[PDB]
Ligand binder design. Structure first.
Ligand SMILES: CCCCCCCC/C=C\CCCCCCCC(=O)OC[C@H](COP(=O)(O)O[C@H]1[C@H](O)[C@@H](O)[C@H](OP(=O)(O)O)[C@@H](O)[C@H]1O)OC(=O)CCCCCCC/C=C\CCCCCCCC
Ligand code: BEF
Length: 965
């Protein structure tokens, strides 16, 4: 439905149509906590500390100070809520910058910004004015023709689309246009190639509307004066918003691993409590309450400290990412999953924006005996300047390059600009202009040049034109010169098709083979000289062959083959290139060397995809490069079967429809094939299919899938991907406004993954190691005391020492791990292989958690038993035993932190000593009610030395042995 009339003031919004601000907002305040709380409190490693601190609801379970349980619970809750709210408001602030762009309007008022622009308010978009919503172009810049919009940031196609103003709206003028014109459009739907509706005028006047009559979403107007359009859809009705899935919160692999080991740790301490209660036997005979009490005692430190440490180390990780000057302006969007980087194994990359700047130029031109590079412009320049032995080759090559195309230049000011249907033509004409034979004027029935040096202006009359078309790959024109009465035909197209029409060309195959190896978009050009009457003979034949209503249109092809394109002289071939992002062709090599199966997923065409892939070293110097294009229906399984037969070592290049079919019916079989390949490339992939592939890879292989992109083409992938990165590109930011991370170019990803991610993961792993170690050591010490004296475990370290060990005395060196560096900043590039060592669960598997358990058990057992050996269990010596136990326990952590530190930074060497000397100011100063004997005699410190020596010698020796081996 949707009858839209200008003069929408009576129903201006008024809930009749949505507003145009596409905010990336989360958690409306009326449902902020009800969502965040129920989200974070479902994982066991959080529910554990919640259930611990929610004890003391029954008085029988009061293990100690209510402060020890409520305080840290509130601390973690408030810190998590604050971080989440800060991230949300920061995203809203950053998004506000693009929501209220300023758009000149014609209905009323001065220019009003977006979020005030709504259905049907005419926008006089200018030049590079990013379109705000879905438009219907009612009037162009008055060329009596069309206007161009480039889809660089909507579907990724690198070629500008053709859009034509509606036929009846070029004459109405503003007065009748505003008053009552009316239009209608179909209800919003997916896809970026369909449209339906009608324009309307007084009485029954009506005309059809088609995809070429509309400008969509963030498509950017290109190379034109201005145009008048009335928005049709807006507010999540755009073709950009409709093709994008709802955002979902994501969780880190490190969080999952810590949950999986916290399950085991809870089971372990529950088993220890059961053992203690059953061993004692006579503990009140209400053994269930006693095992519950012991469980609550043993669980008071580990999980609640783990959440604090992780959530306050994520802040350091995010600050380090956001602050580094080697990756400047890489502001992070999602504070969570900063450590997930470092365990990435797949990387689905976009082509347009991330890889190619969509800038193009004639890198090199070859025309037979020699070749000319862009740097050697001087020779061709002085050759062409004399246009008005090899001169007859080069001059005519350039004179044909400057005339055989579809470009149309226009002047907005003293400078000219190019409106053309393809960057290939744009670059060809730009090269001609640079070498001095600039195109200066264009129109039906006339093509002209402006000549440098001599200042002459050349005028040619195009007699017929054969536009570029798919499955033809040839474009040519018949040119009638009038400076000299000569007729010409000049043709341009793909070598694979033209090579059958060119002269002997004994060198063309060799040159093309050595040309395309660099990924250049090879094109060949030829000519033929005609006369006046022969053109008339051709026209008679072509006019007859153009008979309408007859199903013999191939007569025209036969005529052109007979007369025009049979023996074209070979002027030469030209190599157009895609300007890759800085340092891409080595960054890809580094990433692949680290073990990441870098793929390519693009919305572009197959030829350009292959050319960019070959240019970027994504395909090795020699590979099969299998092609699977336009396969439909299930019967394409023979392609995958032949791929298995080919036995790997053969890159795959697949069309978007083929990928969509294979991922639709042959999910598992296709995945089992593509997994072992070194690289996959997709072409013409719609925004949904990239997200589908990203989901399927993770679902099927378990590995983690990075995704990098820019523009609304990749929002659906970045949201459904892991650690999804966005690039804030020129002329648009919508992708970075929704990505998890942001970077100004693709070169940054090398450092963002190999160094920041790896260091984050290692820091978090070792920090969790130490937290669990310092929890289990005290748990084991209390359990050993209960075993060896039959007293309740809570007797040892009773009072303020539990708080002082949970926090304060020993938090600082444990947090100090998050400032270490595994390797220098620079040495990441020289040894990319290091990142591969994390490919397996080498840091948080049960096989390592149990080793930590054994080491903590030994440490605590030695501590407690040797304290008892150097003291007595009698209550007379309790205040001495507790001291020789607790001080040794604290020094245990303050020594083991220094034992497992890789590089000694200034902060660590300060904080370790500053917490040891804080403990020395601790209970030995105001703690006399516990942990106090004489504590000065030599027999005390000798025993402490012996305990510490026997405690650390195994870890020191093991570290030495396993660093020697
Ligand atoms: C509407 C919602 C309502 C909620 C409101 C809040 C309720 C109460 C708040 C808190 C409760 C208790 C928790 C206390 C901790 C607070 C932690 C935190 O929340 O995070 C905030 C900063 C982040 O840093 P900032 O302080 O914001 O300032 C930074 C900017 O973040 C940073 O962006 C700027 O640089 P770029 O990154 O942008 O380039 C920077 O200039 C500042 O503006 O948390 C932290 O500060 C985390 C700790 C920081 C790490 C410190 C050590 C590590 C760094 C480097 C190591 C190098 C070695 C040094 C050697 C020493 C030689 C002398
Ligand atoms: F090249 Be993608 F569409 F940003």
């Amino acid at each position: 439905e949707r009858e839209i009339h200008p003069d929408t003031t009576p129903v201006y919004d008024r809930n009749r149509y949505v507003s145009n601000e596409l905010s990336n907002a989360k958690y409306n305040a009326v449902t902020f906590v009800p969502t965040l709380l129920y989200e974070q409190f479902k994982f066991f490693y959080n529910l554990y500390f919640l259930v611990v601190a929610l004890s003391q609801a029954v008085p029988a379970l009061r293990i100690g100070y209510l402060s020890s349980y409520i305080v840290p619970l509130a601390f973690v809750l408030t810190v998590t809520m604050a971080k989440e709210a800060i991230d949300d408001i920061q995203r809203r602030r950053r998004d506000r910058e693009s929501n209220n762009e300023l758009y000149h309007v014609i209905t009323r008022n001065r220019s009003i910004p977006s979020k005030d622009l709504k259905v049907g308010d005419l926008i006089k978009v200018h030049k590079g004015d990013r379109i705000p919503a879905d438009l219907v172009l009612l009037q162009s810049s008055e060329p009596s023709g069309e206007s161009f919009i480039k889809t660089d940031q909507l579907d990724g196609e690198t070629d500008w689309k053709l859009r034509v103003a509606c036929p009846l709206t070029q004459n109405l003028s503003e007065n009748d246009l505003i008053n009552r014109i009316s239009i209608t459009a179909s209800a919003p739907e997916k896809s970026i190639h369909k449209f339906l509706g009608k324009v309307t005028y007084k009485d029954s006047t009506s005309n059809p509307l088609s995809v070429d009559n509309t400008l969509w979403a963030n498509t950017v107007l290109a190379s034109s004066g201005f145009c008048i359009a009335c928005v049709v859809y807006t507010g999540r009705d755009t073709r950009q918003a409709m093709n994008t899935t709802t955002a979902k919160v994501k969780t880190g692999l490190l969080e999952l691993e810590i949950n999986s080991i916290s399950k085991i740790l809870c089971a372990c301490v529950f088993a220890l409590s059961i053992l203690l209660v059953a061993f004692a036997g006579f503990h009140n005979d209400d053994w269930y309450i006693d095992i519950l009490r012991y469980l609550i005692l043993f669980s008071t430190i580990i999980p609640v400290s783990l959440r604090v440490n992780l959530d306050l180390a994520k802040s350091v990780y995010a600050h380090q990412i956001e602050h580094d000057k080697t990756i400047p302006e890489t502001i992070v969007r999602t504070s969570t999953i900063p450590e997930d980087l470092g365990r990435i194994e797949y990387l689905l990359s976009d082509k347009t924006g991330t890889l190619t700047q969509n800038d193009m130029q004639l890198k090199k031109i070859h025309l037979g005996t020699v070749s000319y590079t862009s740097e050697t412009l001087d020779i061709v320049s002085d050759y062409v300047q004399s246009l008005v032995d090899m001169s007859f080759r080069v001059r005519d090559m350039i004179l044909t390059l400057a005339i055989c195309h579809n470009v149309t230049p226009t002047f907005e000011d003293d400078e000219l600009t190019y409106q053309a249907a393809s960057p290939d033509e744009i670059a060809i004409v730009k090269f001609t202009e640079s070498v001095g034979l600039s195109l200066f004027k264009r129109d039906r029935h006339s093509i002209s040049l402006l000549h440098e040096h001599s200042g002459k202006t050349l005028n040619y009359e195009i007699l017929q034109v054969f536009p570029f078309n798919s499955d033809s790959k040839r474009m040519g024109i018949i040119v009638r010169d009038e400076q000299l009465d000569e007729y010409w035909f000049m043709q341009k197209g793909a070598d694979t098709v033209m090579s059958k029409i060119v002269e002997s060309n004994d060198w063309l195959e060799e040159e093309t083979g050595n040309m395309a190896r660099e990924g250049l978009r090879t094109l060949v050009i030829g000519r033929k000289k005609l006369n006046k009457k022969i053109y008339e003979q051709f026209q008679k034949e072509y006019n007859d062959a153009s008979l309408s209503m007859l199903n013999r249109d191939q007569q025209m092809s036969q005529v052109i083959t007979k007369y025009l394109e049979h023996d074209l002289e070979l002027l030469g071939l030209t190599g157009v290139e895609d300007k890759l992002q800085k340092d891409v062709k080595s960054s890809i090599e580094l990433l692949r060397n680290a073990g990441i199966k870098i793929w390519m997923l693009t919305g572009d065409k197959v030829e350009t995809a292959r050319c960019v892939s070959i240019s970027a070293k994504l395909i090795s110097r020699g590979q099969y490069v299998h092609t699977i294009t336009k396969v439909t229906r299930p019967e394409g399984a023979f392609n995958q079967l032949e791929y298995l037969k080919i036995n790997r070592n053969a890159c795959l290049l697949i069309d978007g429809e083929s990928l969509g079919m294979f991922l639709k019916h042959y999910e598992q079989e296709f995945f089992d094939v593509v997994v072992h390949l070194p690289t996959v490339i997709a072409c013409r992939c719609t925004p949904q299919q990239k997200a589908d592939v990203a989901l399927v890879i993770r679902k099927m292989t378990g590995k983690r899938v990075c995704c990098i992109g820019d523009g609304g083409n990749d929002v659906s992938m970045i949201q459904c991907a892991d650690v999804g990165v966005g690039i804030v590109g020129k002329e648009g930011k919508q992708a970075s406004l929704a990505a998890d991370f942001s970077i100004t170019q693709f070169c940054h990803l090398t450092e963002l993954l190999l160094w920041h991610g790896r260091n984050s993961y290692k820091r978090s792993a070792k920090l969790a190691q130490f937290v669990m170690h310092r929890g289990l050591i005290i748990a084991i010490c209390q359990a050993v005391y209960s075993i060896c004296s039959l007293f309740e475990p809570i007797a040892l370290y009773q009072g303020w020492l539990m708080v002082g060990y949970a926090t304060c005395y020993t938090m600082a060196p444990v947090f100090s791990l998050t400032l270490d560096h595994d390797i220098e900043e620079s040495l990441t590039k020289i040894y990319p292989e290091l990142y591969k060592e994390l490919t397996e669960g080498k840091s948080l598997s049960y096989k390592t958690f149990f080793v930590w358990v054994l080491l903590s058990l030994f440490q605590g057992s030695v501590i407690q038993l040797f304290s008892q050996a150097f003291t007595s269990l009698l209550d007379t010596d309790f205040t001495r035993m507790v001291a020789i136990s607790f001080t040794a326990l604290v020094v245990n952590e303050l020594i083991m932190v220094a034992l497992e530190i890789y590089t000694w930074n200034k902060t660590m060497l300060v904080t370790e000593i500053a917490t040891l000397l804080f403990y020395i100011v601790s209970v030995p100063f105001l703690g006399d009610y516990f942990d106090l004997g004489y504590m000065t005699t030599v027999n005390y410190y000798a025993g402490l030395l012996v305990i510490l020596l026997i405690s650390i010698f195994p870890v020191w020796t093991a570290k030495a042995i396993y660093r020697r081996l």
